[PDB]
């Protein structure tokens, strides 16, 4: 089933900050804001961790869209191939989640990659989840849903249970 990262990195503070740094031309900015909150809350409702949104500067989880090289040593690659990536919990790049602007993203009402599903998978990594061997899991390695039992099992193994 689920996997974590080697040495099980995790956020050890009671509160972690996040910022949507950059947006996609495919959607309204408010729509990306709401979908990110919804993705974070799928994981957060299961565990004793709180997310605080910020609008400027460097937050613990930095989220955004970019074309090509974008300051980490993992440049995007144009249309197709890599769609997005994210980093395990830690300082600096740790926690950050990046999306390739050279693809087509949707809120479900048009053609595109389902952004809510994509954001839940990437933010999984940002909180310390690796990839699952369970084909039902959001964390399965390849691309209307909810977290699978296996997703919930893993995140609660890493942080404990909320309730």
């Amino acid at each position: 089933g689920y996997s974590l990262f080697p040495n099980s990195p995790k956020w050890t503070s009671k509160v972690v900050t996040y910022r949507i740094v950059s947006y996609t031309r495919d959607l309204p900015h408010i729509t990306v804001d709401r979908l990110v909150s919804k993705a974070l809350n799928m994981w957060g409702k299961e565990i004793p961790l709180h997310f605080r949104k910020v609008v400027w500067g460097t937050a613990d989880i930095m989220i955004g869209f970019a074309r090509g090289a974008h300051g980490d040593s993992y440049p995007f690659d144009g249309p197709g191939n890599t769609l997005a990536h994210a980093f395990a919990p830690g300082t600096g790049l740790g926690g950050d989640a990046h999306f390739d602007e050279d693809e087509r993203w949707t809120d479900g009402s048009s053609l595109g990659i389902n952004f809510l599903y994509a954001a839940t998978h990437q933010l999984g990594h940002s909180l310390g989840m690796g990839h699952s061997s369970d084909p039902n899991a959001v964390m399965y390695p390849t691309y209307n849903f909810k977290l699978s039992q296996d997703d919930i099992k893993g995140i609660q193994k890493l942080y404990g249970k909320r309730s």
Binding site: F5, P6, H85, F87, A88, L93, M129, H131
Partner: peptide, 5 residues
Amino acid sequence: XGLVX
């Protein structure tokens, strides 16, 4: 893609 660093 899950990256480490």
